[PDB]
């Protein structure tokens with residue numbers, strides 16, 4: 001896998017963000033995770049976490065996996081990095097997302113994210129509290 005540039009257009013919620021990629025606006029859905037909806041418990045906190053992380057970054061990058069690059073709703077499916085830290089991983093380390101939606105062929109960072117979830121669950125953080 002490889003990182004490609006993008007710039008933020010707008011934070012949406014815990015696991016969706018609007019980015020400019022190859023010069024075109026796209027909504028990205030973070031691979032391999034699930035944040036609560038804004039209306040559910042920990043939703044606001046996930047949205048805020050992601051928002052802060054993407055808005056404060058000097059450098060946003062997109063990393064597609066090996067499979068499908070857009071989902072059935074036209075959202076890009078990627079690992080998104082903010083100054084080299086994976087937002088997908090950071091949410092999970094924080095107990096603000098679960099590992100979820102693990103489809104064969106776009107699952108490169110599964111075990112990385114599961115390891116983070118195990119540690120969050122042991123700290124009993126947020127979702128795991």
Ligand SMILES: Cc1cn([C@H]2C[C@H](OP(=O)(O)O)[C@@H](COP(=O)(O)O)O2)c(=O)[nH]c1=O
Nearest residue numbers: 029030031032033034071072077101103106
């Ligand atoms: C994360 C991800 C979600 N999706 C689809 C599955 C779910 O379909 P359904 O809408 O039919 O439940 C939906 C979940 O995304 P959200 O959690 O953003 O709703 O997006 C993919 O198809 N591929 C993916 O990698």
Ligand SMILES: [Ca+2]
Nearest residue numbers: 034035036037
């Ligand atoms: Ca969600």
